[PDB]
Amino acid sequence: AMKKFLGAYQNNHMHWVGDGFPVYNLFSYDRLGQTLSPFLLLDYAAPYNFSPTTEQQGVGSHPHRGFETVTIAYQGEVTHKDSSGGGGTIKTGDVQWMTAGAGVLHEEFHSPEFAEHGGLFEMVQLWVNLPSHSKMTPGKYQAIEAKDIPDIALDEHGSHLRVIAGEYADAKGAATTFSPLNVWDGKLVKGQKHTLYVPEGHTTLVVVLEGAVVVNDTNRLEGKTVAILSREGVEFSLNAEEDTKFLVLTGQPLNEPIEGYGPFVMNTKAEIMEAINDFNRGKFGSIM
Ligand SMILES: [Mg+2]
Ligand SMILES: [Mg+2]
Ligand SMILES: [Mn+2]
Incomplete structure (x- = not known):
């Protein structure tokens, strides 16, 4: 869901x-x-x-x-x-x-x-x-x-995601951790949409450092913003309205x-x- x-x-x-x-x-x-x-x-x-x-x-x-x-x-x-x-x-x-x-x-x-x-x-x-x-x-x-x-290309237009910790697209994070968690950062280029999959039950924070991106087609986020998504569910989408620098932070609640x-x-x-x-x-x- x-x-x-x-x-x-x-x-x-x-x-x-x-x-x-x-x-x-x-x-x-x-x-x-x-x-x-x-x-x-x-x-x-x-x-x-x-x-x-x-x-x-x-x-x-x-x-x-x-x-x-x-x-x-x-x-x-x-x-x-x-x-x-x-x-x-x-x-x-x-x-x-x-x-x-x-x-x-x-x-x-x-x-x-x-x-x-x-x-x-x-x-x-x-x-x-x-x-x-x-x-x-x-x-x-x-x-x-x-x-x-590890740096994963999300599209053919310059969007990318770095796997600082955790795992994305079979790529393993560069940092080891004490509990299950993801720290992903990157850039989404204006006009491109992406679906991300997160483990069920994980805290999921979408941090927009700079730019403008729409979450799940209905909520737009600007720079210097953190969005909190539900722990229930495994997927969400990001659609950039402007070149956007972001972080995605997820993890098993302690x-x-x-x-x-x-x-x-x-x-x-x-x-x-x-x-x-x-x-x-x-x-x-x-x-x-
Ligand atoms: Mg893609
Ligand atoms: Mg000194
Ligand atoms: Mn210090």
Whole structure:
């Protein structure tokens, strides 16, 4: 059966994460909760011009525990570094699927190369929740280069879909996951229609970053919008009215409690108290 369109949320109000990430929060667990499971947050840095600088623009040392952060670079580049010495550089087209797990302390900022040359910066940061049993696993990185992400042509006019996680058209996602979920991104060219198939019972979010696309022939979505489709059903259609940059996020709902506070997302208030205590007492370390 067809998934039904339930509603949509458009945000045109930008806020700054540090001095390097001018983002539009498209969804948060704090407002929609379990409806988004397993997804927790989506921040979109729409194209923003940064002139050349000697400074490090971005966000300084901060902690995470209990979930994963996925950084997708569209224009410009992001360098990240943790206290454990690790980190790396996310170039245009690359993805970092970082599992914070038991904990990480890191900084995220424009790469030195991007800082030196300047230009438009565009990225998405998506937070993905972990099942309770997986939340305290050791933190780890998945640095995925643009050339390793399967890219599926949806038509003969330039529409495409990248399988960042999950599976589409027998193509396997580049990032491994702790629960069944899909993260697909791409571009739908004006005047082309596409039917997508999603697993029955999965949360299904259609994120329109830029452009205009009609869902199931009757609901038009503009840029900076997230649409929520019904969990019941396996298919929906997208028909572009303009060249559209999109994400499709689906996943098996975790059906576990969500207790969040700042950059910590756990299952209970007691676990949040432990995270606060661990961080405030300096147990996450420091970045030199
Ligand atoms: Mg096709
Ligand atoms: Mg430094
Ligand atoms: Mn972070």
